[PDB]
Design a protein around this ligand. Structure first.
Ligand SMILES: [Ca+2]
Ligand SMILES: [Ca+2]
Length: 279
Protein backbone atom coordinates (compact mmCIF):
# COMPACT_ATOMS: atom_id res chain seq x y z
CA UNK A 1 0.00 0.00 0.00
CA UNK A 2 1.07 3.60 -0.43
CA UNK A 3 -0.07 6.81 1.15
CA UNK A 4 0.69 9.80 -1.10
CA UNK A 5 1.38 13.27 0.40
CA UNK A 6 1.96 11.64 3.81
CA UNK A 7 3.36 13.51 6.82
CA UNK A 8 7.15 13.63 6.45
CA UNK A 9 7.86 11.17 9.34
CA UNK A 10 5.74 8.38 7.84
CA UNK A 11 7.53 8.89 4.50
CA UNK A 12 10.86 8.85 6.31
CA UNK A 13 10.28 5.48 7.97
CA UNK A 14 9.56 3.78 4.61
CA UNK A 15 12.54 5.34 2.78
CA UNK A 16 16.28 4.97 2.60
CA UNK A 17 16.51 8.72 1.90
CA UNK A 18 15.16 11.99 3.31
CA UNK A 19 12.82 14.17 1.26
CA UNK A 20 10.21 11.68 -0.06
CA UNK A 21 6.47 12.19 0.44
CA UNK A 22 4.93 8.73 0.05
CA UNK A 23 4.49 6.28 2.95
CA UNK A 24 4.82 2.69 1.64
CA UNK A 25 3.57 -0.09 3.91
CA UNK A 26 2.05 -3.55 3.94
CA UNK A 27 -1.77 -3.46 4.04
CA UNK A 28 -1.80 -5.74 7.10
CA UNK A 29 -1.09 -2.42 8.80
CA UNK A 30 -0.80 -3.73 12.37
CA UNK A 31 -4.21 -5.49 12.44
CA UNK A 32 -4.25 -8.01 15.31
CA UNK A 33 -1.81 -6.01 17.45
CA UNK A 34 -2.64 -3.68 20.35
CA UNK A 35 -0.88 -0.49 21.47
CA UNK A 36 -1.36 1.03 24.94
CA UNK A 37 -0.78 4.81 24.91
CA UNK A 38 0.08 5.81 28.50
CA UNK A 39 -0.37 9.58 28.54
CA UNK A 40 -3.04 12.30 29.04
CA UNK A 41 -5.75 10.10 27.47
CA UNK A 42 -7.13 9.66 23.95
CA UNK A 43 -10.05 11.43 22.26
CA UNK A 44 -11.51 8.09 21.16
CA UNK A 45 -14.33 9.72 19.16
CA UNK A 46 -11.93 11.42 16.72
CA UNK A 47 -12.93 10.30 13.21
CA UNK A 48 -9.26 9.45 12.47
CA UNK A 49 -9.38 6.49 14.90
CA UNK A 50 -12.31 4.86 13.10
CA UNK A 51 -13.66 3.31 16.29
CA UNK A 52 -10.31 1.54 16.91
CA UNK A 53 -9.46 3.53 20.04
CA UNK A 54 -10.81 3.17 23.58
CA UNK A 55 -10.02 4.50 27.05
CA UNK A 56 -9.36 1.59 29.45
CA UNK A 57 -8.21 3.33 32.64
CA UNK A 58 -8.00 6.81 34.17
CA UNK A 59 -6.23 7.97 37.34
CA UNK A 60 -8.07 11.30 37.40
CA UNK A 61 -11.71 12.40 37.70
CA UNK A 62 -12.37 11.92 33.98
CA UNK A 63 -11.17 9.66 31.20
CA UNK A 64 -11.06 12.40 28.59
CA UNK A 65 -7.98 13.95 27.07
CA UNK A 66 -8.21 17.60 28.15
CA UNK A 67 -4.67 18.29 26.95
CA UNK A 68 -4.19 16.94 23.41
CA UNK A 69 -0.75 15.32 23.91
CA UNK A 70 -2.10 11.77 24.38
CA UNK A 71 -4.36 12.14 21.33
CA UNK A 72 -1.41 13.38 19.21
CA UNK A 73 0.76 10.42 20.24
CA UNK A 74 -2.05 7.92 19.66
CA UNK A 75 -2.62 9.47 16.22
CA UNK A 76 1.02 8.80 15.28
CA UNK A 77 0.69 5.17 16.39
CA UNK A 78 -2.48 4.36 14.53
CA UNK A 79 -4.77 7.07 13.09
CA UNK A 80 -5.86 6.56 9.48
CA UNK A 81 -4.07 9.60 8.05
CA UNK A 82 -1.29 10.20 10.55
CA UNK A 83 -0.45 6.73 11.83
CA UNK A 84 2.22 4.13 11.25
CA UNK A 85 0.00 1.11 11.94
CA UNK A 86 -3.30 2.09 10.47
CA UNK A 87 -5.30 -0.97 11.57
CA UNK A 88 -3.97 -1.43 15.10
CA UNK A 89 -6.13 -1.37 18.26
CA UNK A 90 -5.44 1.56 20.63
CA UNK A 91 -5.98 1.54 24.39
CA UNK A 92 -5.66 4.73 26.41
CA UNK A 93 -4.32 4.88 29.96
CA UNK A 94 -4.55 8.37 31.49
CA UNK A 95 -1.67 8.74 33.91
CA UNK A 96 -1.05 12.42 33.06
CA UNK A 97 -3.35 15.26 34.09
CA UNK A 98 -4.77 17.80 31.61
CA UNK A 99 -1.74 20.00 32.29
CA UNK A 100 0.40 17.06 31.14
CA UNK A 101 1.75 16.36 34.67
CA UNK A 102 1.71 13.09 36.64
CA UNK A 103 3.32 11.88 39.89
CA UNK A 104 5.69 8.92 39.53
CA UNK A 105 3.49 6.69 41.73
CA UNK A 106 0.60 7.07 39.24
CA UNK A 107 2.75 6.42 36.20
CA UNK A 108 4.10 3.29 37.93
CA UNK A 109 0.53 2.18 38.67
CA UNK A 110 -0.38 2.79 34.99
CA UNK A 111 2.49 0.53 33.86
CA UNK A 112 1.57 -2.28 36.32
CA UNK A 113 -2.03 -1.94 35.10
CA UNK A 114 -1.05 -2.58 31.45
CA UNK A 115 0.99 -5.66 32.39
CA UNK A 116 -2.19 -7.13 33.87
CA UNK A 117 -4.85 -5.72 31.59
CA UNK A 118 -3.27 -7.16 28.38
CA UNK A 119 -4.23 -10.59 29.71
CA UNK A 120 -7.95 -9.72 29.23
CA UNK A 121 -7.58 -8.39 25.65
CA UNK A 122 -7.55 -10.14 22.28
CA UNK A 123 -4.23 -9.13 20.80
CA UNK A 124 -3.20 -12.20 18.79
CA UNK A 125 -0.22 -10.46 17.15
CA UNK A 126 1.19 -8.91 20.35
CA UNK A 127 1.17 -5.87 22.60
CA UNK A 128 3.04 -2.57 22.63
CA UNK A 129 3.18 0.24 25.20
CA UNK A 130 4.15 3.79 24.16
CA UNK A 131 5.35 6.09 26.93
CA UNK A 132 5.95 9.67 25.78
CA UNK A 133 6.78 10.91 29.24
CA UNK A 134 9.63 10.94 31.77
CA UNK A 135 11.35 13.06 34.44
CA UNK A 136 14.51 12.92 36.56
CA UNK A 137 16.10 9.55 37.34
CA UNK A 138 14.02 7.19 39.50
CA UNK A 139 14.95 3.57 40.12
CA UNK A 140 11.32 2.72 40.92
CA UNK A 141 10.15 4.19 37.61
CA UNK A 142 12.85 2.26 35.72
CA UNK A 143 11.87 -0.92 37.54
CA UNK A 144 8.19 -0.50 36.58
CA UNK A 145 9.20 -0.17 32.93
CA UNK A 146 11.44 -3.28 33.16
CA UNK A 147 8.52 -5.24 34.66
CA UNK A 148 6.19 -4.15 31.83
CA UNK A 149 8.74 -5.23 29.21
CA UNK A 150 9.37 -8.57 31.01
CA UNK A 151 5.61 -9.32 31.15
CA UNK A 152 5.72 -9.55 27.34
CA UNK A 153 4.96 -6.00 26.14
CA UNK A 154 7.16 -4.07 23.70
CA UNK A 155 7.92 -0.90 25.72
CA UNK A 156 8.98 2.22 23.80
CA UNK A 157 9.87 5.33 25.81
CA UNK A 158 10.90 8.90 25.00
CA UNK A 159 14.56 9.83 25.50
CA UNK A 160 13.54 13.31 26.73
CA UNK A 161 13.90 16.88 25.49
CA UNK A 162 16.84 18.30 27.55
CA UNK A 163 19.60 18.12 24.91
CA UNK A 164 21.39 16.01 27.54
CA UNK A 165 22.55 12.49 28.33
CA UNK A 166 19.41 10.38 28.81
CA UNK A 167 21.11 8.44 31.64
CA UNK A 168 19.72 10.99 34.11
CA UNK A 169 16.09 10.56 33.04
CA UNK A 170 13.45 7.93 33.68
CA UNK A 171 12.10 5.68 32.25
CA UNK A 172 14.52 6.64 29.42
CA UNK A 173 17.53 5.31 31.33
CA UNK A 174 16.13 1.77 31.83
CA UNK A 175 18.25 -0.41 29.56
CA UNK A 176 15.72 -3.15 28.93
CA UNK A 177 13.11 -0.96 27.13
CA UNK A 178 13.38 0.81 23.76
CA UNK A 179 14.60 4.36 24.27
CA UNK A 180 13.79 6.70 21.35
CA UNK A 181 15.52 9.96 20.33
CA UNK A 182 14.16 12.45 17.79
CA UNK A 183 15.31 13.54 14.32
CA UNK A 184 14.14 16.28 11.91
CA UNK A 185 13.16 16.45 8.19
CA UNK A 186 16.77 16.90 7.14
CA UNK A 187 18.15 13.89 9.05
CA UNK A 188 19.60 15.99 11.86
CA UNK A 189 19.23 14.99 15.52
CA UNK A 190 16.42 17.25 16.75
CA UNK A 191 18.00 20.14 18.66
CA UNK A 192 16.18 19.26 21.93
CA UNK A 193 16.73 15.49 21.72
CA UNK A 194 18.51 13.70 24.58
CA UNK A 195 21.34 11.35 23.48
CA UNK A 196 23.77 8.93 25.11
CA UNK A 197 24.58 5.25 25.19
CA UNK A 198 21.13 4.26 26.47
CA UNK A 199 19.34 5.35 23.28
CA UNK A 200 18.32 2.42 21.11
CA UNK A 201 16.99 4.22 18.02
CA UNK A 202 15.87 7.49 16.51
CA UNK A 203 12.54 8.33 14.90
CA UNK A 204 11.01 11.48 13.42
CA UNK A 205 10.24 14.04 16.16
CA UNK A 206 10.39 17.60 14.73
CA UNK A 207 7.20 19.13 13.34
CA UNK A 208 5.01 16.07 13.38
CA UNK A 209 1.42 16.36 12.17
CA UNK A 210 -1.14 14.26 14.03
CA UNK A 211 -4.57 14.29 15.62
CA UNK A 212 -5.54 16.81 18.30
CA UNK A 213 -8.53 17.23 20.67
CA UNK A 214 -11.76 18.79 19.35
CA UNK A 215 -11.49 16.57 16.28
CA UNK A 216 -8.61 18.73 14.96
CA UNK A 217 -4.97 18.27 13.94
CA UNK A 218 -1.75 20.02 15.01
CA UNK A 219 1.99 19.83 14.36
CA UNK A 220 4.22 19.65 17.47
CA UNK A 221 7.80 18.57 18.23
CA UNK A 222 9.53 16.32 20.78
CA UNK A 223 10.90 12.94 21.61
CA UNK A 224 7.24 12.43 22.59
CA UNK A 225 6.45 12.40 18.80
CA UNK A 226 9.36 10.08 17.88
CA UNK A 227 8.30 7.41 20.41
CA UNK A 228 4.91 6.57 18.78
CA UNK A 229 6.56 6.15 15.39
CA UNK A 230 8.65 3.35 16.89
CA UNK A 231 5.71 1.92 18.90
CA UNK A 232 3.63 1.89 15.69
CA UNK A 233 6.53 0.30 13.74
CA UNK A 234 6.86 -2.50 16.32
CA UNK A 235 3.08 -3.17 16.12
CA UNK A 236 3.40 -3.26 12.33
CA UNK A 237 6.35 -5.70 12.43
CA UNK A 238 4.76 -8.00 15.03
CA UNK A 239 1.63 -8.49 12.89
CA UNK A 240 3.92 -9.30 9.90
CA UNK A 241 5.52 -11.98 12.13
CA UNK A 242 9.01 -10.47 11.67
CA UNK A 243 9.67 -10.12 15.40
CA UNK A 244 8.19 -10.47 18.92
CA UNK A 245 7.66 -8.14 21.86
CA UNK A 246 10.88 -9.35 23.51
CA UNK A 247 13.11 -8.75 20.47
CA UNK A 248 11.33 -5.92 18.56
CA UNK A 249 13.67 -3.16 19.76
CA UNK A 250 16.74 -5.19 18.69
CA UNK A 251 15.10 -6.07 15.34
CA UNK A 252 14.28 -2.45 14.59
CA UNK A 253 17.90 -1.46 15.45
CA UNK A 254 19.27 -4.31 13.28
CA UNK A 255 17.14 -3.25 10.31
CA UNK A 256 17.43 0.55 10.73
CA UNK A 257 18.93 3.04 8.32
CA UNK A 258 22.50 3.31 9.61
CA UNK A 259 24.74 6.37 9.64
CA UNK A 260 22.18 8.70 8.02
CA UNK A 261 21.85 11.21 10.86
CA UNK A 262 24.05 14.25 11.56
CA UNK A 263 24.65 16.02 14.91
CA UNK A 264 25.04 12.57 16.60
CA UNK A 265 27.55 12.77 19.49
CA UNK A 266 30.22 10.03 19.70
CA UNK A 267 28.85 7.15 21.79
CA UNK A 268 25.26 7.51 20.58
CA UNK A 269 23.80 5.17 17.95
CA UNK A 270 23.30 6.47 14.42
CA UNK A 271 20.19 4.43 13.63
CA UNK A 272 16.87 5.63 12.18
CA UNK A 273 13.75 3.44 12.31
CA UNK A 274 12.93 1.93 8.89
CA UNK A 275 10.21 -0.56 7.81
CA UNK A 276 12.18 -2.22 4.98
CA UNK A 277 9.01 -2.40 2.84
CA UNK A 278 9.36 -4.15 -0.54
CA UNK A 279 6.16 -4.19 -3.67
CA1 LIG B 1 20.35 6.53 3.70
CA1 LIG C 1 17.42 -0.37 25.46
Amino acid sequence: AAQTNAPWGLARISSTSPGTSTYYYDESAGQGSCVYVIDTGIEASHPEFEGRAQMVKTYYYSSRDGNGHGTHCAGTVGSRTYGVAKKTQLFGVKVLDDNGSGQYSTIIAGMDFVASDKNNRNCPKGVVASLSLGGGYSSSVNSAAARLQSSGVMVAVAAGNNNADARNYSPASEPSVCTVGASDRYDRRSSFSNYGSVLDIFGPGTSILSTWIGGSTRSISGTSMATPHVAGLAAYLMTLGKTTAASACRYIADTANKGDLSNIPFGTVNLLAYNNYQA
